[PDB]
Amino acid sequence: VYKRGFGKINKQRVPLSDNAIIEANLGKYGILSIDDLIHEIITVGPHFK
Amino acid sequence: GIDHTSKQHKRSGHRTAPKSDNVYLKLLVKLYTFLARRTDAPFNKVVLKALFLSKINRPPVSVSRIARALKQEGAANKTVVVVGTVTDDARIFEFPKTTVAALRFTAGARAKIVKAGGECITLDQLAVRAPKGQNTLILRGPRNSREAVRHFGMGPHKGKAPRILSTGRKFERARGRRRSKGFKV
């Protein structure tokens, strides 16, 4: 995630270079940082999909 | 290599500009391009796209159609918006006192609206009065009443009009159209 992590925003591939973009797209699920995204993956949480 | 699930370099398939070279029409497109970008009003986006339509996609709207729409509940004082031509209809004998904005008015249509106490305005005048389409009513004419449509989808048991030049007794009413001559469709 740190090296090759890109997000899908408006059908576009955007690098995850700051926590602001993650919050703006996954904040409604409680994910607001790159570590929150990692936590949701390693522990398969309610919002894994 | 990439396994493509869809066609690459595919155009959207919608017109982004009018095909005509009318200089005055381009000015209206420039006005509503600015409004659609900086108003987030759904009305402005609809009007801008309607300015790109071809002639068959903008059927005429008669004054009788305008009068019928004004008879709707609560629509008596709304401004009728037609992106196209408004024609006259002599089959109706009473007309309201509404305000109509359209690209073009025929001589009969303009006279009938003014005689009833209304006014005919252009689309740029409408933008000044209602920049966000306040209290407007958009009317579109009928597309499937065109003569070309009745020939589309021709085939057995389809009930469509054949493409024929001369119509009469001896023109495509024999075998294939009646049971006494072979079969019926």
């Binding site: 090296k3 690098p15 270079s17 940082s33 | -």
Partner: protein
Amino acid sequence: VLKKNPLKNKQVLLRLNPYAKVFAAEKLGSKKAEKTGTKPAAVFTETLKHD
């Protein structure tokens, strides 16, 4: 305009993950384990060495 990889650019590693400063300060990557002296039962050892 240029993707800078964290874990090789320390400044970018600090912009994300404000806990990296605490992780390095207390040496969480070399944390020792508490010593325990529990031993396996005889049945486990005999089964392991059984033919």
